[PDB]
């Protein structure tokens, strides 16, 4: 199915590190560094409403570099999506960090050719997005505040109950979708895989290395970073790409956290 | 076999399905037009009935036989279908055994009737295997139809209003209802609810068995002068848009 | 018009009572004391009658023959129907079968009563099809206090909208929970557009003209039976002369 | 019927987008960019009908359609309004609310009347009044689109709930919305509003015009570069599903 | 009765706009555009305590002006009003938008040989003040927020009890007084009459020459005004008066709103 597709697409991204950049020289900054892909956006401290930013700046960003290019488009705003698809980026994020745009639906991601990556706080937002068609979940915490408390809290969520839907008798996991109010069908593949069928990464404060180590050892396949709002950019995005790809080696995690400069 | 087990309860389509709690009783029915009979022994705790009493039940008629098993009680459930029954009825009407699970459907080869509210909890009974579901009104002997009207009309408005819903806006129906989104789907698509749906409750008159069918049901449960009453329901379900036909029926009934 | 018609069907008793009977007995008294019709029922659960005794009460009077259908149960009303009743009163007092929906009555050629405690409810049942309101009270009391108000809920809601700056009308609606149209008829008459009786409590001569001094076109009623049948229907015809009134309430004997 | 006239005479501006102007100038360059109609107005404090001072030199300045703002229930603004030719009259909860419990009796004027609405009840009922032409209003000047998908969402929500109901419930589905009878009867056969459907309420760029479009709305009004992002809601509105014109348009528009 | 010839003297006001003036100019500006009568006072926006104003400027405009002059005494300062009467003004307004003097009653106006104007919000509170003695209504909304929205409440709220009284039945109608309140004669009064027994005006947030128009089509005798706090006072005190002289006419009221400056 094109949905098993847009699923493997994501695979790719394993082991990554996702970053966001506002302009050209941070994309190229981001990739030297070694990021897995860059997300492409033009919030908290400022307030006005955060909408999809604008293709020309998406345009010059999918030229500046080689690694996959993401831009976010306002929840249930299809057309947002619709006009993403349209510039050619290699995936979309239906993002909750910009301007809700419809308080009771999602996007219908499956309408699309190009695959999703949608946010959840727990298991069941997440089969839910899912089913939707999201092809790739993160697990957000709290956003631009650099605390990493709350992505703890849904890592553990969405993984805890994975491990008690892994063990469940099986005539009680349909009252267990039903509490989840998350498609059963969706919820027995996922007691059967042992995991979340498709790509999970974290996401949400996550600040230094031993945060983005943490949230590997957790289980995530990977982070999202906002990086460009500290000390040495580069640096610093170098030694969270290190520490997702080394997160169970303490050694080298404190050769990378050493010298890092103002978080 | 689920879509076999599903295709069965089709045969239902049309019939009065009546509680029985003897072979006498069953025989009536069946003479009468039962298209099948339910067997019962009857405050107290309610459970599966006597494996002697369904086994005369089921050797004194022809057509299908069905049986209580408490909610989740799979093991009732083990039993009825080791003696043969053609179809099992988890049923609220009997003592819950569990009042967080139901029998998970599937484990079985008979097809299994449940009584449901509403569509969301009719989709959760048919995920997890029911063939056929009743719409349930009041679960004493009350004679009123008023619960079951208003189950009945539930179950069709829903489906209704998913036949012509915005596919986009179909999952946050499906999380609201808490129902299954694939089943919800087959739902939308198909117009109707995916198996045979009966309604039970209250049925008393004749004029009340053709009220559900008039409401769209498949068929009615029904629990002085029995077998006139038994025939007058028969014939109001096989002539349900015919007001004479009702009106004959219903002339003499004793009493209610 | 069909239901202008149906509307007409019903005027034919203005000025009249409207007595209950359970047998062709009961149903010759009424007619004998000079009821306009009758209304046949056998009395849990309250259904419709059985299709037998209707019929019987039908060849055994000359007047009109009414009879209930629960709330919603427009099955029981196609059998009342088919039984060649003149008027089906989907009823209150019967039990209700559809809490949420009443009778779709424009889907019948009979015409019909429907029951109501203010002028909101009055102009819904009428929408939906009913060709008479009997404005309810209390039911099996004997107690006129309900009745009372809600003709005079009724009447006095139709005098505001008399009166009102039609600007103010459609706002009216909406708090009244009412068909705008059927509003703005109700404010062109002066009055409900259909036969309006009273019912629930009336008990005696002087109950019976009370409702007709408040402005109903009749009623209806549910010691000495032929006595009081008599009393009450001159009391309707002589509402508003106290002499009758009291020639027929002397010696009336426990009511 | 005069009804029926005026609402032919907003069916003219389907498929198009109003933009509103405070002078003389605004107006060339929203005509300019392909506005289909003007919404003349001079803007905390209280706001009422703008001086027909400068509605008369706005709609000497273009040749499409001039609408004006009057208060709610503001029925002499309403007049003086309609002395002076004005095409639309936008009775507008965005004006400060004149009166409380009514509304303008719009059946009472000749021009065609603009009325805003969050649900399907409430479109109904300025229709009622006379409203030739429904705008389903999210906010109003926070450039956040959130509030007007709800109520577009409500409104064609229902309206396709209305579409398949069985009719015996159309009654208490008129009663619950606390809407003239008639009028959803006529909305369950017309399958839609018996009037032009606009939408309005924090477009702020050519995605959010076409998402409106796209959700079923017959246009959209709007409240950087201003000739430049007007033409680029024009045309997305004109193109609300071409994508590939929705990239182009949208490309380096500016601060929104 | 001396009543009926205070509620006489009111009939001449009919058709009217009274004018708030704090000074001679003004209250010549008022009679210059047709104001029928003048309300001299030296108050939301500041505070402090609202009271009767100081005779001397009273006695000034009483001069400037030759229609009648008309003067604030606050609500149950019977002595304040004792003052007014004998610097020999018109009308006096026991009036709300000073600062209430006596929380439990009103002046007793039937003691005065001058005739009063009362505010009032609905129908009960009008016919108490009338039965007190007031010879003149003035149905108020807010007070110096350029709003006409209560205004209008109260009006329909009036004329709207009116209606429903008129046709009422005569045995209802003793429950009605004691619903609203007030002496059942007057209610009686009312309803044989159809109206109120008195002169009634609109008075509250009047700033448009629309406004004014729209109080007199909802059936008021006339309007008050608050005019110089906006652009040009002449052109606008003049344009009010020719809409209240022809508030059925679009066209004329097309033409005075006109051109009007910051209202």
Do not use: W
Request: hydrophobic letters at 45%; charged letters at 25%.
């Amino acid at each position: 199915s094109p949905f098993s597709v847009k699923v493997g697409l994501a695979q790719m991204l394993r082991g990554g590190v996702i970053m966001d950049v506002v302009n050209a020289e941070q994309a190229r900054i981001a990739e030297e560094a070694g990021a897995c892909a860059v997300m492409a956006l033009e919030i908290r401290a400022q307030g006005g409403v955060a909408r999809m930013s604008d293709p020309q700046m998406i345009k010059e960003i999918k030229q500046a570099v080689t690694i996959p290019v993401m831009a976010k488009a306002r929840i249930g705003h299809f057309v947002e999506a619709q006009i993403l698809e349209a510039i050619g980026i290699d995936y979309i994020d239906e993002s909750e960090v910009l301007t809700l745009a419809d308080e009771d639906h999602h996007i219908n991601k499956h309408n699309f050719r190009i695959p999703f990556v949608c946010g959840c706080r727990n298991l069941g937002e997440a089969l839910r997005r899912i089913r939707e068609g999201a092809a790739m979940i993160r697990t957000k915490g709290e956003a631009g505040t650099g605390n990493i408390i709350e992505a703890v809290r849904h890592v553990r969520s969405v993984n805890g109950d994975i491990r008690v839907l892994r063990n469940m008798d099986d005539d009680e996991v349909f009252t267990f979708a039903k509490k989840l109010a998350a498609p059963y069908d969706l919820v027995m593949q996922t007691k059967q895989l042992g995991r979340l069928p498709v790509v999970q990464f974290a996401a949400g404060g996550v600040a230094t290395p031993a945060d983005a180590a943490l949230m590997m050892q957790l289980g995530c396949d990977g982070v999202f970073v906002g990086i460009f709002k500290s000390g040495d950019p580069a640096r610093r995005a170098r030694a969270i790409v290190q520490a997702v790809t080394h997160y169970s080696d303490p050694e080298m995690l404190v050769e990378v956290s050493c010298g890092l400069g103002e978080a | 076999p689920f879509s076999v087990k599903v295709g069965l309860a089709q045969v239902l389509r049309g019939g009065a399905i009546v509680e029985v709690s003897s072979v006498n009783q069953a025989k009536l029915a069946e003479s009468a037009g039962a298209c099948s009979v339910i067997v019962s022994d009857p405050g107290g705790v309610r459970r599966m009935p006597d494996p002697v009493l369904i086994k005369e039940v089921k050797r004194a008629v022809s057509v299908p036989v069905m049986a209580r098993a408490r909610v989740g009680h799979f093991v009732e459930a083990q039993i009825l279908e080791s003696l043969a029954v053609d179809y099992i009825d988890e049923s609220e009407i009997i003592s819950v055994a569990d009042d967080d699970h139901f029998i998970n459907k599937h484990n079985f080869r008979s097809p299994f009737i449940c009584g449901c509210r509403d569509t969301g909890e009719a989709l959760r009974r048919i995920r997890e295997g029911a063939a056929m579901i009743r719409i349930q009104g009041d679960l004493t002997a009350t004679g009123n139809i008023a619960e079951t009207v208003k189950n009945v009309r539930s179950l069709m408005g829903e489906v209704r209003v998913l036949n012509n819903m915005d596919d986009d806006e179909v999952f946050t129906f499906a999380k609201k209802i808490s129902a299954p989104y694939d089943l919800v789907a087959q739902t939308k698509q198909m117009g109707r609810v995916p198996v045979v749906q009966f309604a039970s409750g209250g049925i008393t008159t004749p004029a009340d068995a053709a009220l559900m069918m008039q409401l769209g049901c498949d068929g009615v449960f029904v629990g002085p002068d029995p077998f006139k009453k038994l025939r007058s329901i028969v014939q109001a379900v096989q002539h349900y848009n015919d007001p004479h036909v009702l009106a004959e029926m219903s002339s003499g009934l004793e009493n209610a």
